[PDB]
Amino acid sequence: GAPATVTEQGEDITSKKDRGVLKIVKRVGNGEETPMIGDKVYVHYKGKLSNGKKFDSSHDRNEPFVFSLGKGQVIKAWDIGVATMKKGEIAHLLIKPEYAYGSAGSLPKIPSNATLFFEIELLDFKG
Ligand SMILES: COc1ccc(CC[C@H]2OC(=O)[C@@H]3CCCCN3C(=O)[C@@H](C3CCCCC3)NC(=O)C(C)(C)N(C)C(=O)COc3cccc2c3)cc1OC
């Protein structure tokens, strides 16, 4: 499945080069601009525990998810990952626990020491 292909083939997009955030581009975006630190970002997403049978279904797929990039409003992996995405891009991210919920997790849905998998679609961004 996609987590194994991303662990196998994914690009390391970390500063540390610890393969803690691994990326495969699923749909090539528009042009060359990526969102910048402090921009509002608008995405759709699907997340799961990387071992997980199905994507989590507990958010509205219609409504864009919105956050301010690089401001610690999301797990570290998203501040890293989304910054790399072109408008219209769909990417896969495979994330080690130190770029997600670490030792604490976030019970019940996210256990301690959880590796996560996302599909993200970058819809738009604005300064
Ligand atoms: C700076 O560090 C953090 C900042 C914010 C948080 C709160 C959780 C945060 O969730 C996320 O960052 C990620 C990525 C953005 C989409 C939602 N996130 C999820 O982890 C998913 C998760 C993926 C694994 C499968 C189970 C679900 N969570 C969600 O999809 C749900 C709907 C379950 N969830 C509670 C939220 O999306 C709550 O809304 C958020 C809004 C902003 C940031 C976070 C969550 C946690 C942080 O560190 C642990």
Author numbering: 13 to 139
What's written in the study?
A typical example is the family of FK506‐binding proteins (FKBPs) that possess a highly conserved binding pocket but have diverged to perform diverse biological functions. The larger homolog FKBP51 is a regulator of glucocorticoid receptor (GR) signaling and has emerged as a potential target for depression, obesity‐induced diabetes and chronic pain. The most advanced FKBP51 ligands are compounds of the SAFit class (Selective Antagonists of FKBP51 by induced fit), which bind to a transient binding pocket unavailable to FKBP52 and are up to 10 000‐fold selective for FKBP51 over FKBP52. During a macrocyclization pilot study, we observed that many of these macrocyclic analogs have unanticipated and unprecedented preference for FKBP51 over FKBP12 and FKBP12.6.
As intended, the interactions of the pipecolate, the A‐ and B‐rings, as well as the cyclohexyl group with FKBP51 were completely conserved in comparison to previous FKBP51‐SAFit co‐crystal structures. Strikingly, we observed that the carbonyl group of 13 a, 13 d and 13 h displaced D68 and replaced it as a hydrogen bond acceptor for the ϵ‐hydroxy group of Y57. The rearrangement of the β3b strand is stabilized by an inward flip of H71, which partially replaces S70 and substitutes the former as a hydrogen bond donor for the backbone carbonyl of Y57. Intriguingly, H71 is replaced in FKBP12 and FKBP12.6 by an arginine (R40 in FKBP12/12.6 numbering), which can be expected to be less efficient in stabilizing the 13 a‐binding conformation, providing a molecular rationale for the discrimination vs. FKBP12/12.6 observed for the macrocycles. Representative macrocyclic compounds 13 c, 13 e and 13 h as well as SAFit1 and ‐2 all dose‐dependently competed with a fluorescent NanoBRET tracer inside cells. Compound 13 d as well as compounds 13 c, 13 e, 13 h and 13 i all inhibited IKKα phosphorylation, similar to SAFit1 and SAFit2 [4f]. For 13 c, 13 d and 13 h, the apparent maximal inhibition was already reached at the lowest tested concentration of 1 μm, possibly reflecting the higher affinities and/or improved cell permeability of 13 c, 13 d and 13 h compared to 13 e and 13 i.
